[PDB]
Amino acid sequence: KIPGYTYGETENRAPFNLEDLKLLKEAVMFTAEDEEYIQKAGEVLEDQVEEILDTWYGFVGSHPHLLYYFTSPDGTPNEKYLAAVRKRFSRWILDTSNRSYDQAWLDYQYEIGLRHHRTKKNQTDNVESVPNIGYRYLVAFIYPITATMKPFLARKGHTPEEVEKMYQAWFKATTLQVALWSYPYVKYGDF
Amino acid sequence: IPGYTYGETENRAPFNLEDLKLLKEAVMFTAEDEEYIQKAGEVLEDQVEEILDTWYGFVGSHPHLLYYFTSPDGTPNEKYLAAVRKRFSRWILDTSNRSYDQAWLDYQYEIGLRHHRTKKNQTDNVESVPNIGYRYLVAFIYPITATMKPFLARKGHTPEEVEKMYQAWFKATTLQVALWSYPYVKYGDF
Ligand code: HEM
Ligand code: HEM
Ligand SMILES: [C-]#N
Ligand SMILES: [C-]#N
């Protein structure tokens, strides 16, 4: 077991439902075509996750105000916090590509939003760190997530057209998830 | 353009140029993107009517999106759509041509306020739904980029150049929706 990873065992139901998920998928233009290519993206990314993790956390680590969210109160990075989260982020890459986007998935999406938010941040790993990740950065991060995935998607010799489809699927699926994560941040009734 | 008040908003944004610098860093937006978004402008400018049809065609294709433009009777308000269309058209140019300075930031606060319940329906003085749910503003980052993509290639630029214009557009669209979140986000959580 991955420490802290509680997919399918959240014991709180998400405040958004499967119909909400359907309508949100429509808003990010996500169809059965993207179901085919997000799973293909998984097949491509799964063997490269160590270098993907290094690239992603290298980006976070290169900006003081982003690495900030993993720091101890004294301003120094908490490497145990970073390492524990890294294992769950690694799993998230596989989940995004491999899970059915069903109620169990939606319950975990609510959980992931809660963990970035002050509601549950720092509780999973029992660490002491900054209390909230400003929402502005969750949205911002849609971009660098997609930009870090893009080069890796080419590395199994899929055609340019297939790589482009895998990248677009990833983009849709990343946007969809960050939308859902906004829930605990948004003024009640405005989501 | 009716309702377009860029430069003359009379609220200062609650985020500042330092906040903008840090958020640009989070979406990997640099001077290179400033150059390529300007080029994207040059490419898109004379294609705006097709862009608009493609964009509002998508909104109009799903009842739960077209909803945000509807009158109480559930039918689209055509006055509202028409007036917004002109400002959206201008936004394509503003995104490409404006310096992302304080006046830009102030208008980004305003655009967020106008999607949000705070100022929605007020600019055009229409009776419509009170709030655009935030979930959709984030969602719409994707369709904005997928709408621009094919037009970015229509003036003969190489795939390498189209990709730079496209990535710049993506970054700049994500940056703006991040700022538009402000009025939606619980105080202290942004
Ligand atoms: C597209 C946006 C983002 C994605 C896809 C993403 C992905 C993830 C994932 C998959 C996890 C682990 C979830 C789990 O516990 O199973 C996580 C946790 C975490 N992420 Fe992100 N994240 C994003 C935004 C951000 C931002 C902007 C930061 C700021 C540095 C950040 C820093 C963290 C931190 C500090 C945790 C640990 C939260 C906790 O205490 O539980 N994330 N992220
Ligand atoms: C990336 C996301 C989005 C972008 C780039 C965008 C762009 C714009 C722009 C440029 C305007 C005019 C702003 C001005 O007054 O100068 C506007 C207004 C408007 N948009 Fe969006 N928009 C987005 C999300 C959405 C969504 C999800 C909807 C839902 C259908 C929507 C529906 C509307 C409506 C109803 C108005 C008029 C609001 C008012 O009463 O002033 N927009 N949008
Ligand atoms: C988050 N990583
Ligand atoms: C907005 N359109």
Residue numbers in the entry:
A (entry chain B): 5 to 195
B (entry chain A): 6 to 195
Copy out sentences from the published article reporting this entry, exactly as the authors wrote them.
The MaPgb* structure can be considered as an expanded version of the 3/3 helical sandwich typical of “classical” globins (i.e. Mb), with an additional N-terminal extension, built by a 20-residue loop, followed by the Z-helix, which precedes the globin-fold conserved A-helix. Residues belonging to the Z-helix contribute to formation of the Pgb homodimer, which is centered on the intermolecular four-helix bundle built by the G- and H-helices of the two subunits.
On one hand, the cyanide N atom is linked to Tyr(61)B10 OH group (2.84 Å and 2.71 Å, for chain A and B, respectively), on the other, it is hydrogen bonded to Trp(60)B9 Nε2 atom (2.98 Å or 2.99 Å). The rotation of the Phe(93)E11 side chain allows the rotation of the Trp(60)B9 side chain of ∼90° towards the center of the haem distal site. As a consequence, in the MaPgb*(III)-cyanide complex: (i) tunnel 1 is hindered by the Trp(60)B9 side chain, and (ii) the Trp(60)B9 Nε1 atom is at H-bond distance to the haem-Fe(III)-bound cyanide ligand.
